[PDB]
Write a protein that binds this DNA or RNA. Structure first.
Ligand SMILES: [Zn+2]
Ligand SMILES: [Zn+2]
Ligand SMILES: [Zn+2]
Ligand SMILES: [Zn+2]
Lengths: 77, 76
DNA sequence: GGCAGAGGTCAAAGGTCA
DNA sequence: CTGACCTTTGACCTCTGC
């Protein structure tokens, strides 16, 4: 009955943009895609996305978001 | 129009669990972020008001905590 | 109907920099 | 260090199309 975000391991509201996601992960994906935002990383793209420290590397979040099958094409827009 | 429990200034909004001015919000963030502890030169009951808020950082932080600002809420 | 999976709001967190 | 002011986040909403 409990489902966890494939990005950050937070309680997941459900499948969003093709991925079991927390509400935070959804909204990041949207804004990133809607604003055509690519970010950069300052730690050799090694950044580990955890519920606690997910807002550390926007770049590394979007990497994991796409890695885990969130789909730009699914965000309206 | 609501007033900051720490300094008594006009509050921006509720900040870390208490109706706070931006200043005390800022103070609180940086204090917890840099795990700053503070020393008092006036026996630790320094009056904290808008006009004279920055005399004692120590006494301010005490007030911040006492009036219910929650460190845990401030993030890393 | 019923509900997943899109959308949006705005307080409360964040970061900026004179 | 400070705080006026600006940006992001994510809990909680609604809509609507299978
Ligand atoms: Zn997540
Ligand atoms: Zn990174
Ligand atoms: Zn104040
Ligand atoms: Zn003092």
């Amino acid at each position: 009955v409990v489902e966890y975000c494939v990005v950050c391991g937070d309680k997941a509201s459900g499948r969003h943009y093709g991925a079991v996601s927390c509400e935070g992960c959804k909204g990041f994906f949207k804004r990133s895609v809607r604003k055509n935002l690519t970010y950069s990383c300052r730690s050799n793209q090694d950044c580990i996305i955890n519920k606690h420290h997910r807002n550390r590397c926007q770049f590394c979040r979007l990497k994991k978001c796409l890695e885990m099958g969130m789909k730009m094409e699914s965000v309206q827009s």
